Scaffold this active site. Sequence first.
Site, PDB file in Angstrom:
ATOM      1  N   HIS A  21     -27.762  37.357 -12.263  1.00  0.00           N
ATOM      2  CA  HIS A  21     -26.346  36.962 -12.503  1.00  0.00           C
ATOM      3  C   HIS A  21     -26.191  36.074 -13.744  1.00  0.00           C
ATOM      4  O   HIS A  21     -25.029  35.805 -14.120  1.00  0.00           O
ATOM      5  CB  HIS A  21     -25.651  36.409 -11.263  1.00  0.00           C
ATOM      6  CG  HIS A  21     -26.053  35.039 -10.878  1.00  0.00           C
ATOM      7  ND1 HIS A  21     -26.929  34.815  -9.823  1.00  0.00           N
ATOM      8  CD2 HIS A  21     -25.681  33.837 -11.364  1.00  0.00           C
ATOM      9  CE1 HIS A  21     -27.076  33.504  -9.681  1.00  0.00           C
ATOM     10  NE2 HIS A  21     -26.326  32.882 -10.623  1.00  0.00           N
ATOM     11  N   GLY A  72     -25.956  24.734 -13.093  1.00  0.00           N
ATOM     12  CA  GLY A  72     -27.076  24.673 -14.036  1.00  0.00           C
ATOM     13  C   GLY A  72     -28.415  24.798 -13.341  1.00  0.00           C
ATOM     14  O   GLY A  72     -29.404  25.016 -14.048  1.00  0.00           O
ATOM     15  N   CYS A 130     -29.456  27.017 -11.090  1.00  0.00           N
ATOM     16  CA  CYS A 130     -29.893  28.393 -10.804  1.00  0.00           C
ATOM     17  C   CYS A 130     -31.175  28.743 -11.577  1.00  0.00           C
ATOM     18  O   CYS A 130     -31.355  28.352 -12.703  1.00  0.00           O
ATOM     19  CB  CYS A 130     -28.751  29.373 -11.035  1.00  0.00           C
ATOM     20  SG  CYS A 130     -27.488  29.164  -9.757  1.00  0.00           S
TER      21      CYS A 130
HETATM   22  C1  LIG Z   1     -26.087  29.244 -10.739  1.00  0.00           C
HETATM   23  O1  LIG Z   1     -26.068  30.538 -11.287  1.00  0.00           O
HETATM   24  C2  LIG Z   1     -26.016  28.298 -11.894  1.00  0.00           C
HETATM   25  O2  LIG Z   1     -26.623  27.231 -11.877  1.00  0.00           O
HETATM   26  N1  LIG Z   1     -25.245  28.697 -12.934  1.00  0.00           N
HETATM   27  C3  LIG Z   1     -25.196  27.944 -14.155  1.00  0.00           C
HETATM   28  C4  LIG Z   1     -24.056  28.157 -15.096  1.00  0.00           C
HETATM   29  C5  LIG Z   1     -24.140  26.902 -14.298  1.00  0.00           C
HETATM   30  C6  LIG Z   1     -24.873  29.043  -9.786  1.00  0.00           C
HETATM   31  C7  LIG Z   1     -24.936  27.711  -9.017  1.00  0.00           C
HETATM   32  C8  LIG Z   1     -23.626  27.300  -8.351  1.00  0.00           C
HETATM   33  C9  LIG Z   1     -23.599  25.873  -7.863  1.00  0.00           C
HETATM   34  C10 LIG Z   1     -24.889  25.432  -7.256  1.00  0.00           C
HETATM   35  N2  LIG Z   1     -24.727  30.167  -8.843  1.00  0.00           N
HETATM   36  C11 LIG Z   1     -23.601  30.885  -8.794  1.00  0.00           C
HETATM   37  O3  LIG Z   1     -22.650  30.689  -9.541  1.00  0.00           O
HETATM   38  C12 LIG Z   1     -23.475  31.922  -7.703  1.00  0.00           C
HETATM   39  C13 LIG Z   1     -23.266  33.269  -8.335  1.00  0.00           C
HETATM   40  C14 LIG Z   1     -21.818  33.676  -8.109  1.00  0.00           C
HETATM   41  C15 LIG Z   1     -21.133  32.552  -7.359  1.00  0.00           C
HETATM   42  N3  LIG Z   1     -22.250  31.677  -6.936  1.00  0.00           N
HETATM   43  C16 LIG Z   1     -22.170  30.727  -5.988  1.00  0.00           C
HETATM   44  O4  LIG Z   1     -23.113  30.006  -5.717  1.00  0.00           O
HETATM   45  C17 LIG Z   1     -20.822  30.551  -5.273  1.00  0.00           C
HETATM   46  N4  LIG Z   1     -21.026  30.741  -3.848  1.00  0.00           N
HETATM   47  C18 LIG Z   1     -20.799  31.933  -3.265  1.00  0.00           C
HETATM   48  O5  LIG Z   1     -20.178  32.849  -3.851  1.00  0.00           O
HETATM   49  N5  LIG Z   1     -21.259  32.034  -2.006  1.00  0.00           N
HETATM   50  C19 LIG Z   1     -21.011  33.167  -1.101  1.00  0.00           C
HETATM   51  C20 LIG Z   1     -19.465  33.365  -0.953  1.00  0.00           C
HETATM   52  S1  LIG Z   1     -18.587  32.022  -0.181  1.00  0.00           S
HETATM   53  O6  LIG Z   1     -19.084  30.767  -0.670  1.00  0.00           O
HETATM   54  O7  LIG Z   1     -18.608  32.217   1.237  1.00  0.00           O
HETATM   55  C21 LIG Z   1     -16.871  32.102  -0.743  1.00  0.00           C
HETATM   56  C22 LIG Z   1     -16.370  33.512  -0.436  1.00  0.00           C
HETATM   57  C23 LIG Z   1     -16.810  31.824  -2.241  1.00  0.00           C
HETATM   58  C24 LIG Z   1     -16.052  31.061   0.012  1.00  0.00           C
HETATM   59  C25 LIG Z   1     -21.606  34.471  -1.645  1.00  0.00           C
HETATM   60  C26 LIG Z   1     -23.125  34.439  -1.723  1.00  0.00           C
HETATM   61  C27 LIG Z   1     -23.688  34.213  -0.341  1.00  0.00           C
HETATM   62  C28 LIG Z   1     -23.187  32.889   0.186  1.00  0.00           C
HETATM   63  C29 LIG Z   1     -21.667  32.855   0.249  1.00  0.00           C
HETATM   64  C30 LIG Z   1     -20.046  29.261  -5.550  1.00  0.00           C
HETATM   65  C31 LIG Z   1     -19.883  29.095  -7.052  1.00  0.00           C
HETATM   66  C32 LIG Z   1     -18.666  29.389  -4.908  1.00  0.00           C
HETATM   67  C33 LIG Z   1     -20.719  28.002  -5.005  1.00  0.00           C
HETATM   68  C34 LIG Z   1     -22.952  34.485  -7.502  1.00  0.00           C
HETATM   69  C35 LIG Z   1     -23.216  35.828  -8.152  1.00  0.00           C
HETATM   70  C36 LIG Z   1     -23.143  34.530  -6.000  1.00  0.00           C
END
Ligand SMILES: *[C@](O)(C(=O)NC1CC1)[C@H](CCCC)NC(=O)[C@@H]1[C@@H]2[C@H](CN1C(=O)[C@@H](NC(=O)NC1(CS(=O)(=O)C(C)(C)C)CCCCC1)C(C)(C)C)C2(C)C
Lengths: 306, 306
Positions: free
Chosen positions: B41, B143, B145
């Site tokens: 991603h 950051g 990830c």
């Molecule tokens: C990571 O990639 C990173 O450090 N990125 C660098 C640029 C800064 C990053 C870390 C996030 C904070 C710790 N990871 C992501 O962005 C991932 C990717 C996109 C969104 N997230 C992600 O962690 C989501 N969480 C999320 O989507 N979780 C769910 C869905 S959910 O939370 O139930 C809801 C529908 C949003 C309410 C899907 C995955 C399984 C767990 C639940 C958040 C940014 C919202 C924290 C990817 C592709 C999943």
Amino acid sequence: SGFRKMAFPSGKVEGCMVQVTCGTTTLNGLWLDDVVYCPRHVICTSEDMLNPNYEDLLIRKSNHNFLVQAGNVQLRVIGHSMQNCVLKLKVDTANPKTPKYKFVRIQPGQTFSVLACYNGSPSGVYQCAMRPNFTIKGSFLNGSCGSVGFNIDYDCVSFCYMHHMELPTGVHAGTDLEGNFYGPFVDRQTAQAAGTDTTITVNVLAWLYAAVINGDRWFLNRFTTTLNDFNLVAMKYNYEPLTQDHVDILGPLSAQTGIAVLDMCASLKELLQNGMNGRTILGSALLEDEFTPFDVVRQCSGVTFQ
Amino acid sequence: SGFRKMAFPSGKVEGCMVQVTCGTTTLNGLWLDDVVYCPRHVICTSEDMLNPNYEDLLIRKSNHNFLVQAGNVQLRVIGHSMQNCVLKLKVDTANPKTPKYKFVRIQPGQTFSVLACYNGSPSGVYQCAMRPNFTIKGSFLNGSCGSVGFNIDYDCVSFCYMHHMELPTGVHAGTDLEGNFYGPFVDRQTAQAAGTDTTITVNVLAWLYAAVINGDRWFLNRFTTTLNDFNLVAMKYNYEPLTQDHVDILGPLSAQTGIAVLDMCASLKELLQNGMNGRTILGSALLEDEFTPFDVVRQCSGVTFQ
Ligand SMILES: *[C@](O)(C(=O)NC1CC1)[C@H](CCCC)NC(=O)[C@@H]1[C@@H]2[C@H](CN1C(=O)[C@@H](NC(=O)NC1(CS(=O)(=O)C(C)(C)C)CCCCC1)C(C)(C)C)C2(C)C
Ligand SMILES: *[C@](O)(C(=O)NC1CC1)[C@H](CCCC)NC(=O)[C@@H]1[C@@H]2[C@H](CN1C(=O)[C@@H](NC(=O)NC1(CS(=O)(=O)C(C)(C)C)CCCCC1)C(C)(C)C)C2(C)C
Ligand code: NA
């Protein structure tokens, strides 16, 4: 998000740990430039410990009685001296892995990372606070003496602790890297007074701020208090008095959350008086006091190191 | 003595962390030999995340779109491929700091060390368990990830976890280093079922053994139980069933303390039914379940690493 008791990366310190043997005692030394630092009680027999005369024990020792090993490789000892409760062994080779470093004497309520070591080999890394009674709650077995505590300030390693001894409560006492004991302790195996272990109020508040930032908010209430009223309640629970300096230090956390320190103190007062009613904060059933405001800011803002 | 949540020394892993940028996303990669591993991603825009077609997004990318930086020094990308949910970036230089390593897929209830990293720079180190619902309770900001989880087996680093995403409960999901998610999770920003978070019974017992070894014995009682009776009580508290394999695994701890596993289970049953009555065990008011029997043996016997 999430909030964990996190140590500094240990790599820069792992490169400095050596094994030091004198007679039948093996423990750890810290190798920086051409000096190896270790606890002076490396020279003692089990009988000596009861009432050691370190000047008299040390006189019986020469450079060749101090066996210093860096992994598999033997270091040549060209000098030895005692500074307070540490031995300085001068070796004929500067540690090529010496990081930028300083020796700092930490304040009570400040935290640091411990690299637990055995036979000069790093075992593990954990975070400790210097307790208000100048003890730490560590994990130290036989062989762990000379293990060090440190902070990393970007690329610079501030060494603040060397492990020497265990109190009957199972907590830990040691020296700064100038060999001065934290607290009233002396390196002799005799009954010694440890202070009451008070809670680091400012650290508990920092951690409540961490909880709110991480969305644990159940303990927020409609109330406020004053420094003077909070402190009356806290003293009954063996909490350190909260000062205006502590309020100022929490500034970034109060600023980030929009929750005044005195309002958070109102939350803490209710938690002290009422307990947690089987609930948890950041997965803890007790009030955590081993996170400084800097630790919380650091981990909730995420700045890194060399 | 003393017993702490202790991570492995992080030095061997610190030497492998790099920064990986694709478009406006910066996160962490793992540099081993001439391959950099990172979450796929990294290629996504914030809109892509809602419903990404990774094959279609990846086709728009060439080697020169993956910016890989090892401290201040840029690495040349000569290849890229997707394996499950990780990208493998082939670089023209083998990491000179590559330790002896393997990729392992850990079992639920097993622990590992996390080196939290930002912009390819190590921030801190802490211990996690792989929960029975294949989540971890970490500390990961934006950051973080590509931050990895590992064990050290003397000189050999077993990588078991790469950080990808956060659940709404604030717990963490990621992959092994073959890019297969732990648990039912997929790398898409949509509502996804996480399992009930059950307690790792065998780990709670290990920790009670640690407590007794460290002289916390107040919770020992005059009682015993059977696997079948213990499990009836445990299921009500969302504890994993205890098996004869678990009894056998605790063997060193029961052997060291002289306390039969079923007698310790009797203690745990009373603590579950009665609570702790405001008392603490190894400074905790909750039953700790993120120490494996191996973790306890290791820290109560003190064996070290390279
Ligand atoms: C990571 O990639 C990173 O450090 N990125 C660098 C640029 C800064 C990053 C870390 C996030 C904070 C710790 N990871 C992501 O962005 C991932 C990717 C996109 C969104 N997230 C992600 O962690 C989501 N969480 C999320 O989507 N979780 C769910 C869905 S959910 O939370 O139930 C809801 C529908 C949003 C309410 C899907 C995955 C399984 C767990 C639940 C958040 C940014 C919202 C924290 C990817 C592709 C999943
Ligand atoms: C350390 O040197 C080491 O790792 N040695 C290598 C060879 C294995 C070793 C670590 C011990 C276990 C963690 N440290 C010591 O041996 C020190 C030195 C001798 C005795 N101890 C020590 O820790 C004592 N504790 C101790 O004496 N503590 C007190 C006295 S007491 O505990 O109240 C009592 C009178 C014994 C009941 C004195 C110091 C201040 C705190 C109290 C034990 C071995 C008993 C744990 C030195 C010189 C202190
Ligand atoms: Na607790």
